[PDB]
Design a protein around this ligand. Structure first.
Ligand SMILES: *C/C=C(C)/C=C\C=C(C)\C=C\C1=C(C)CCCC1(C)C
Ligand SMILES: *[C@@H]1O[C@H](CO)[C@@H](O)[C@H](O)[C@H]1NC(C)=O
Length: 326
């Protein structure tokens, strides 16, 4: 063999030895070293012990603090919730699994895991588009001034959850399916079987075009455009350089949250994709394990970039923790 096609799983390990068990019945210790399986669980623990407060803290600095009612404060408060859903939904279940070297919870567990991660990535990807749009509408202003009401922010934040669920939910109902990846301690969209009863190949190419391409294409159109008013339509469009200061600061962060995304997220699809097309070309259980567990930091770093490149915020953040003020 290459790997071992099951009813609800696929493995990158030869059943020519017979040795292949199922990731819903007993240990996959036969995949790497039972020292290595601990490494997942160890990694997962820090990310659980990291995301919880650094995402809890921001989801509260804001709910508490007043002045913090700007369109960015919302989206970074939208990741603030999205991330804790990864952690208490995905991560707890994903970790607990790696100690066992296989899912104990049945596929009924590999749903949360896969789901609540797909989910978090998609709220991230979309929270960027609405962030990108915002920057376009704000920096190189189009026409007049229905300039964002706290309203338009809602319509945006609610926007992400919608779009982001139009990707994660379907595989859950059986437009696709959450299935164990790599070392079988992470679950992600069935790129493996051609399995027919879920029209697999459709959903997978669905999920790319509209939850990858398009999302990016919008992002990218706005990307460059974020260098037009940082110059001449600023030297000409007379905006007090007190605003070409705080606003040219928001643009850096956003720009960096993008890079951040593509640094973190791109390697996963590097494989996810390769798999889909070179389906059944032999490969190991570390091929898709690294990108998965790595890209899984998506539930940690955005609130931090935020403490690191947003001064007003950071100062409320210390006000909170230090009681009264700094
Ligand atoms: C650790 C396990 C995870 C993150 C499980 C599943 C992830 C996906 C199905 C990824 C979806 C995608 C995202 C979130 C962003 C880039 C496009 C994508 C389809 C690879
Ligand atoms: C092949 O793998 C299957 C399914 O995991 C398993 O049930 C079977 O015992 C293995 N092969 C043999 C020859 O028994």
């Amino acid at each position: 063999m290459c790997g071992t096609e099951g009813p609800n799983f696929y493995v990158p390990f030869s059943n020519k030895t017979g040795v292949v068990r199922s990731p819903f019945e007993a240990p996959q210790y036969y995949l790497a070293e039972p020292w290595q399986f601990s490494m997942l669980a160890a990694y997962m623990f820090l990310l659980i012990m990291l995301g919880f407060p650094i995402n809890f803290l921001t989801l509260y600095v804001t709910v508490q603090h007043k002045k913090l009612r700007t369109p960015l404060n919302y989206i970074l408060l939208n990741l603030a919730v999205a991330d804790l859903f990864m952690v208490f939904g995905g991560f707890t279940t994903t970790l607990y699994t790696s100690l066992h070297g296989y899912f104990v919870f049945g596929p009924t567990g590999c749903n949360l895991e896969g789901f609540f991660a797909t989910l978090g990535g998609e709220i991230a990807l979309w929270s960027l588009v609405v962030l990108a749009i915002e920057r376009y509408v704000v920096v190189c202003k189009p026409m007049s001034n229905f300039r964002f009401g706290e309203n338009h922010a809602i319509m945006g934040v609610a926007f992400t959850w919608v779009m982001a669920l139009a990707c994660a939910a379907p595989p859950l109902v059986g437009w696709s399916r959450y299935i164990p990846e790599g070392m079988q301690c992470s679950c992600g969209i069935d790129y493996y079987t051609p399995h027919e009863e879920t029209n697999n190949e459709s959903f997978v190419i669905y999920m790319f075009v509209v939850h990858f391409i398009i999302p990016l294409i919008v992002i990218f159109f706005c990307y460059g455009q974020l260098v037009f008013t940082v110059k001449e339509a600023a030297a000409q469009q007379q905006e007090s350089a007190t605003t070409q200061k705080a606003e040219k600061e928001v643009t850096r962060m956003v720009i960096i949250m993008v890079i951040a995304f593509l640094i973190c997220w791109l390697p996963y699809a590097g494989v996810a994709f390769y798999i889909f097309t070179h389906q059944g070309s032999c490969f190991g259980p570390i091929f898709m394990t690294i990108p998965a567990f790595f890209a899984k930091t998506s539930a940690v770093y955005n609130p931090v970039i935020y403490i690191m490149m947003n001064k007003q915020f950071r100062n409320c953040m210390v006000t909170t923790l230090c009681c009264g003020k700094n």
